[PDB]
């Protein structure tokens, strides 16, 4: 580092060490210990350069062994000693210890290896601050993989979690990008969702503007898919579909596109009114793609036009159909995203007939509904929370008045511009008699 | 009164950093620590001790 003569004194001997590198073979056949020995000297220099020459020779001593496990302790634990005394600089051990951790990777064939691996490499990058940090992630996270064949797949996904909130400046925007997913993954198979929610907002969607970045785009919303689906917000889920479908990916290639507008239908009926609702629904009615499809084409038209509709007809259509398509309605938390489906017909007849019936016996409307008694007046009750309708249900069952009743203001308001329309329109018809009777 | 309205809302600023929309116990501890530190007499009150 300091003075002239480090660079060139240092770097002479571990020349004269390299020269001298057979003999370190040797006799490390013969015992471990006696070519161990010779590292220690090595790695004990003050020029940063000549420790870089030597830490070739850290990594080859243990593969001329091949390897065992009682040595590996070791030879990472004198690296470790080795970095809280100097180093050459605390910054330089760093970059040996780089070298030495791509050869944990290669080594690994046993679970024997991986499990004694991880050990070592979690107490070394306590006190490091580079891509080690990455690098003792990941290698973390083979031992994962295999904790998800095993009772402690929630265990595993926390240890690893909490790592990837340190934003490395070490990693490049691709990589930081496929971190962070893995993590969203993680935690779906934690079964914790709240977790979820705070590594989705890690990445951003403003970190998805060129096609280097296409690809983790796709995976990004699928993922966020599942996340909201388990909540429940139907809406959202749609919204996802939407992007991917937005995606040049899927654009431009016919056969990919095909579930996704599938699917893009189905969250968009199971969403409950609300008039954002609406023009996304709107939207998809235009495309082109689904009017090749007829199935979902026949549903998304169905449910955007006003229409009067019974329920076990309409589940007669689509019981062969749309219900044993999978990730939909043919999985099994999704058998009740099927009982859903008739919550969303049973409001689209309530909203149609609360406009165009003023009043309708409650005794008929049952009828129509494809409901009992009981279970119409809750339903009609939650709407008039929600603000949407309004109605006057009677317990006699006698009527149910789908009118808000009108006021005495408007009504006369009404009216006095229906009698200027009439004088309007007189006073225009009569220019027109002249002009036709000329003309002829 | 003031400097606890300082507290939200640099913690709030640290929600965002953090990527919650939630402010949590660790966010008020560092508006607390910070914003309430400044100058130094340390030293100059060794000798009026």
Known sequence: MSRDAPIKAD?????????????????????????????????????????????????????DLLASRNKWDDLNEQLTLLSKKHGQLKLSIQ???????????????????????????????????????????????????????????????????????????SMEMSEKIQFILEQMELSILKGDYSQATVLSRKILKKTFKNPKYESLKLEYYNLLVKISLHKREYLEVAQYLQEIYQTDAIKSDEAKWKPVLSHIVYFLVLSPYGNLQNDLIHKI???????????????????????????????????????????????E??????????????????????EYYSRITLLRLNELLDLTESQTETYISDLVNQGIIYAKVNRPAKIVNFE?????????????????????????????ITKEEIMH | ?????????????????????????????????????????????DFYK
């Not at chain 1, 001997?13 to 056949?29: G, M, N, R, T, V």
């Not at chain 1, 808000?404 to 009569?430: A, F, M, R, Y």
């Open chain 1, 11 to 63: 770097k002479d001997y571990s020349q004269i060490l390299k020269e001298e590198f057979p003999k370190i073979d040797s006799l490390a056949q013969n015992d471990c210990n006696s070519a161990l020995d010779q590292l220690l000297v090595l790695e004990k220099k003050t020029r940063q350069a000549s420790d870089l020459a030597s830490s070739k020779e850290v990594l080859a001593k243990i593969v």
């Open chain 1, 95 to 169: 970059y040996m210890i780089q070298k030495v951790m791509e050869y944990l990777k290669s080594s690994k064939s046993l679970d024997l290896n991986t499990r004694i691996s991880v050990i070592e490499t979690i107490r070394v990058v306590t006190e490091n601050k580079i891509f080690v940090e990455v690098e003792r992630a990941r290698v973390t996270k083979d031992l994962v993989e295999i904790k998800k064949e095993e009772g402690k797949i929630d265990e595993a996904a926390d240890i690893l979690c909490e790592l990837q909130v340190e934003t490395y400046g």
């Open chain 1, 285 to 331: 009615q235009n495309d082109n793609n689904l009017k090749k499809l007829e199935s979902q084409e026949s549903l998304v038209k169905l449910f955007t036009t006003n229409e009067l509709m019974r329920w076990p007809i309409v589940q007669k259509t689509y019981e062969p159909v749309l219900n044993e398509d999978d990730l939909a309605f043919g999985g």
């Open chain 1, 333 to 354: 938390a999704n058998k009740h995203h099927w009982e859903d489906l008739q919550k969303r017909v049973i409001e689209h007849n309530l909203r149609v007939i609360s």
């Open chain 1, 404 to 432: 808000k009743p009108k006021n005495s203001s408007q009504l006369l308001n009404e009216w006095s511009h229906n009698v200027d329309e009439l004088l309007e329109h007189i006073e225009t018809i009569g220019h027109l």
């Open chain 2, 1 to 45: 009164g003031a400097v606890i309205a300082a507290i939200m809302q640099e913690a709030g600023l640290r929600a965002v950093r953090k990527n919650r929309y939630v402010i949590l116990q660790s966010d008020l501890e560092e508006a607390y620590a910070t914003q309430v530190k400044t100058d130094n007499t340390v030293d100059k009150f």
